[PDB]
């Protein structure tokens, strides 16, 4: 043991100052809007462009598109013309005998510009925690179908994080398929998911479209550029910093029911240039592993409590909400949740690690893990070695530059630290 004044107490991680961080997901998350059809009784796979047109025909408020929030560093007319080109090419498809399996677009000046044919610090914005909260929530629809792993599946089947998995596996598989099939062509790819309502009816959902650029993906690190065009009811003026990488169009009038009654709200199109590597597309196609990762964490956790009682607690926890875990916080203090909330929070964490995969995240994870073990040992009054805390903090803080997900994880780690070493 050493004198108290010489003992090193882990300090809060220092998060960067700067302009607020911006969205960098490959698709919209909480801001997404689905145009949906209730599928036939048979629930037979339609072809994507047929389903996409049929979904767009469920919306009756389409209007002439206009730019409402320009991309600071882009040629905004090119984004506006790209969307008009998508609608013109969909009309071309409608005019033909049959809907085609695939649509290779005209390589216009606007698509060549948009398909190419960050070390500045940013501060943590509120929108990242707001996204994570929404990912933890239950939706009205089921995203998967059902060894007592059915407890877990029951708690996550309707979870929004599960929608993100199904949306990500669909679009990355479709983009890999197009990338192999049509390497030189600008292919129009509907962004689709399938779910089931409370009433057991299957639904097909259209989020928007991506346009694939040139895709000669010889190596895992080779990049395919794409343009994403995504429906939303989110007014870009609420959080402009979130949308720094986007051009936002107003494309329609949506009738919605509210308190005053039925009201018109704008439908927007969030448009950006983006890219992905072959390896990143392959990891996108593996997002179901998020369900297995979070399931394993829940199991490992239930074993601990079952290893205490010398009895399997699986049945008790899921069936009896009485047992709780700390998973949230407010101005008041730490909030505890039933095992179901823990399932959804761990799933959402695993899903967000996939949606926001980065080298900064890999560095943050490996290094923060070492610091977490030191903090746990300090909580337990075990006198861990601290000689390398200087090195550890340098390594962690080099990862805290501008990445929204890494910054939120640092802020979360800090909240944990204030409670852990109270």
């Amino acid at each position: 043991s050493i004198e108290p004044f010489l003992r090193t107490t882990p300090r809060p991680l220092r998060l960067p100052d700067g302009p607020l961080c911006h969205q960098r997901s490959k698709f919209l998350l909480m801001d997404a809007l689905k145009l949906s059809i209730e599928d036939p009784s048979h629930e037979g796979e339609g072809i994507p462009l047929y389903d996409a047109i049929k979904c767009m025909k469920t919306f009756f408020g389409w209007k002439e598109p206009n730019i409402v929030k320009p991309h600071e560093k882009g040629i905004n007319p090119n984004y506006l013309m790209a969307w008009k080109q998508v609608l013109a090419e969909l009309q071309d498809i409608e005019n033909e005998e049959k809907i085609p399996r695939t649509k290779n677009m005209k390589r216009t000046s606007q698509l060549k510009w948009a398909l190419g044919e960050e070390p500045e610090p940013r501060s943590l914005a509120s929108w990242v925690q707001n996204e994570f909260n929404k990912a933890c929530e239950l939706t009205d629809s089921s995203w998967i179908e059902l060894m007592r792993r059915n407890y877990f599946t029951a708690e996550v089947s309707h979870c929004r994080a599960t929608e993100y998995i199904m949306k990500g596996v669909y679009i990355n598989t479709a983009l890999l398929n197009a990338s192999c099939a049509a390497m030189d062509d600008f292919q129009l790819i509907p962004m689709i998911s399938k779910c089931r309502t409370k009433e057991g009816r299957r639904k097909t959902n259209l989020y928007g479209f991506i346009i694939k650029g040139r895709s000669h993906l010889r190596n895992d690190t080779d990049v395919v550029n794409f343009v994403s065009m995504e429906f939303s009811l989110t007014d870009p003026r609420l959080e402009p910093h979130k949308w720094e990488k986007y051009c936002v169009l107003e494309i329609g009038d949506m009738l919605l029911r509210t308190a005053i009654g039925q009201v018109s709200r704008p439908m927007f199109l969030y448009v950006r240039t983006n890219g992905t590597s072959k390896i990143k597309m392959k990891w996108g196609m593996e997002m179901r592993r998020c369900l297995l990762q979070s399931l394993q964490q829940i199991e490992s956790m239930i074993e601990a409590e079952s290893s205490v009682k010398e009895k399997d607690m699986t049945k008790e926890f899921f069936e009896n909400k009485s047992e709780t875990w700390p998973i949230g916080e407010s101005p008041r203090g730490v909030e505890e949740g039933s095992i179901g909330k823990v399932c959804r929070t761990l799933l959402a964490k695993s899903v967000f690690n996939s949606l926001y995969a980065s080298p900064q995240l890999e560095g943050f994870s490996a290094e923060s893990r070492k610091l977490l073990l030191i903090v746990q040992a300090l909580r337990d009054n075990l006198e861990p070695g601290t000689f390398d805390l200087g090195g550890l903090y340098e390594a962690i803080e080099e990862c805290l530059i501008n990445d929204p997900w890494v910054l939120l994880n640092a802020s979360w780690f800090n909240s944990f630290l204030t409670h852990a070493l109270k």
Binding site: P326, S330, T345, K349
Partner: peptide
């Protein structure tokens, strides 16, 4: 606000 690090408190 959900924060999965708070699980480590238990």
């Amino acid at each position: 606000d959900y924060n999965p690090y708070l699980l480590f408190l238990k």
